Amino acid sequence: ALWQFNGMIKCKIPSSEPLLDFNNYGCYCGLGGSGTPVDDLDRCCQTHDNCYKQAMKLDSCKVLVDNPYTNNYSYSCSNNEITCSSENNACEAFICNCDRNAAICFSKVPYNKEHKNLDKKNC
Template sequence: MTQHLTLSLVLFSLPSSNIRGKVGVSSVMYPTALLLLLTAYVAHGSLLQFARMIKCTQPGVNPFMYNNYGCWCGLGGTGNPRDELDGCCEVHDHCYQASRHLPDCRTVIDYPYINLYRFSCANGQVSCSASSHVCQVSVCECDRVATNCFAKSTYNPKNKNLDPKVHCLS
């Protein structure tokens, strides 16, 4: 996984003319390639761990059904939560934000979505590993609390894929 990040940083640090001149990448493809590399790295990070946690607390549920739910589930978030489940995502977003501000949690890429951690699942309960770094434990706890909140909340299909400009005003 570190290789994906290293490759992304190396490509990002090279002048675009060097890359275009050597491999024929257009100026449109260059940023797209960087985005895809970073996405590939992130997809193997804590987002998939978060999905596995959801599967632990809710076997048989597709964890990606929570993406783009309400005003807070997915990347970003704004406005008032639509329901209790959306509120779980608001708390989760604020928890990630707090993790980013811990003194020991400054990294090259200051982003909780790629902070790998260790956890275990037993009988539908998630436990974060105390042997992980403080940042990893913090992100893991954010995800653990959110998965427990999801499991206790009702999913309303009407809150999926809302237009935030219409439905997520403060």
């Protein structure tokens, strides 16, 4: 769920408020996404959106009322690394992996502030 993804990104980027910094960035970072990623961060968000789309196709996820934004799963941050828990059921474990991969991708690419609150004419 979104709260865990928030905690994951802070795990890798301790100076960020993820819901502020990485919301509404580029064509993909944020609810929705369309068109060509504007940079590498946006491309991280595109992969993550595609991972969420693949999760919602799985039979395990289809059974659950919860969607990837509200489906709580368990993970730990320890020494700035993320580990998804073996206690997670198949759906929540796939989502945890999506989010972990996105948090790592976020920490390894440039942040271009001029893509912040990008006017969606560009997408």
